[PDB]
Design a binder for this molecule. Structure first.
Ligand SMILES: [Mg+2]
Lengths: 317, 319
């Protein structure tokens, strides 16, 4: 095995051990226990968020979808008066509602100085694809009443990255204008692939062990029975959906199981002539930036804010 | 170690073939016999050049610019009208010790042919006979000469492996000399920074695993070319210097996903972004260091297109 990456701050090295301590025990398919565990995990990261960042949050309903609107406590910045971001939370498509959503929205709202509308989308296994696309699209449609499409960004982490990419295709199915920019962080509209799922240990490899091929679909209940050929569901595997993608930020830890898929999606975006940016944080795991107590998380929030700042329009609307 | 993984499932059949040939073509131990080592890599580079000539149609001329030997590589069809007032400078790889001649054409030919541009590949001074900053001086002298014919904004500089390191160092040397900075650079599989992070362990540059506890990595590049240069020389290690990083031109960083240089390139890209520099990073999952010297796979053609696309979007056009 490996020492921690020698690029990491002392604070990140501490976070790595806290991450290890916070890892889930085996649930053996007990969704109730699993949801309760991750509820507490997300509530814990929320407390850390609130210590670092000063925000105000309000509940709203937009086109019959529950959202939380997250803003810097004293107001959005003049630079971002006519912009908004939609956040789509992660949580394996089965949890993350409420505190998980605030944990992704608060650091970006506070770092960029922008309104973040985080969507309480329908979750699996009770709901299945394309429920979350429909929900995010309904919110987007409502926000178009106030903000130019060029000035709206959509981002999310892990499952939320996947749903962000699927929401783009659903928006185009509905005949609405595409968003100004997206962030598909730690996940996008494509299966995990390449080397990283083996290195990250999501699939066993090594002495005494037969390493299997990887799946061509995402294994989640959310995607049960959706075909590989559905370009709306898996747009980053489709040369057709890819060309219509808006400017995209892809960001992951270097040890994240999603990283090989993101580097491929970035190559495909570039060949399609789509503006895209990829950043990797060596040594860090999946969805590392839910832990705000390290310079590397603040840096990630700065890269997300800078990508939206440089790609979204400014004009009212 | 990667040997426990299957080939990346992203790879074309052609690339899986290349990876088997790459492993089979790996060098034996030379034990400080530099003459034998150079002969082995002369053969390797000649072999790749044969492959390049099958795929691409170019013409090469020798020239001397400011007392430095170059080869000027152009598409056999001619430079596109779009690229009439552009030029790229190539700085070859080869561990700072070999690669001169055929190794330089192996890097220049695919880019000249793919972009439709003239590439000047520099026959710079090698280690261990010559030491830093000899290669920076050579590349700067070439750049100086090309400024007589092309606007700085229309000149790119790129190189692979040791040549990616030297391209970054040449940029700081050009600045030191008071010349205008180049329009864009490609620091491929290497830049002005030591190797760092996880990737040198994963690639086996430092022995790694069960029962053998991994040593720290050096904060310096180990090559004889760089021996005695301090970590604090910002001109030698610019991507660890906030000052030289801010002055970098738009930069492409590209590597194989299994390349020992990956982790350093991802950090350099974060630093360039924080410094406000236009940079772009691409990683080819499953592929090793300097993978695009083997042209017989879709992934290599795809790399050449990304390099051509980066320069086509970042360099100026006007005479
Ligand atoms: Mg990029």
């Amino acid at each position: 095995w490996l020492p921690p990456s020698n690029q990491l701050s002392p604070e990140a090295r501490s976070v790595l051990d806290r991450m290890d301590a916070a890892k889930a025990p085996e649930f053996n398919g007990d969704l109730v226990r699993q949801r309760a565990f991750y509820q507490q995990f997300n509530d814990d990261r929320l407390v850390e968020m609130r210590r670092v960042f000063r925000t105000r949050e309000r509940h709203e309903t937009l086109n019959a979808v529950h959202v939380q609107v997250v803003e810097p406590a004293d107001g959005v910045s003049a630079r971002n008066r006519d912009r908004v971001l939609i956040n789509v939370h992660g949580g394996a498509f089965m949890w993350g509602a409420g505190s998980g959503a605030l944990v992704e929205a608060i650091p970006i709202a506070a770092t960029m100085g922008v309104s973040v509308v985080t969507v309480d989308y329908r979750l699996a296994p009770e709901n299945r694809y394309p429920a979350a696309s429909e929900d995010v699209t309904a919110v987007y449609r409502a926000l178009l009443e106030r903000y130019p499409a060029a000035n709206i960004g959509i981002f999310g982490s892990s499952a939320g990255g996947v749903i962000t990419a699927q929401a783009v295709t659903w928006i185009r199915r509905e005949g609405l204008p595409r968003p100004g920019a997206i962030g598909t962080l730690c996940g996008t509209g494509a299966p995990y692939s390449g080397d990283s799922p083996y290195l990250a240990g999501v699939v066993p490899v090594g002495p005494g062990v037969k390493a299997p091929p990887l799946p061509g679909l995402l294994p989640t209940a959310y995607m049960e029975g959706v075909g590989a050929d559905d370009a709306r569901a898996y747009p980053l595997t489709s040369d057709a959906e890819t060309v219509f993608m808006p400017p995209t930020l892809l960001l992951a830890g270097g040890r994240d199981f999603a990283v090989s898929a993101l580097s491929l999606a970035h190559r495909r975006l570039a060949r399609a002539g789509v503006d895209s940016e990829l950043h990797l944080f060596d040594g860090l795991p999946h969805a590392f930036f839910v832990w705000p107590d390290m310079p590397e998380s603040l840096e990630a929030y700065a890269l997300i804010a800078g990508f939206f700042d440089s790609r979204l329009g400014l004009t009212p609307s």
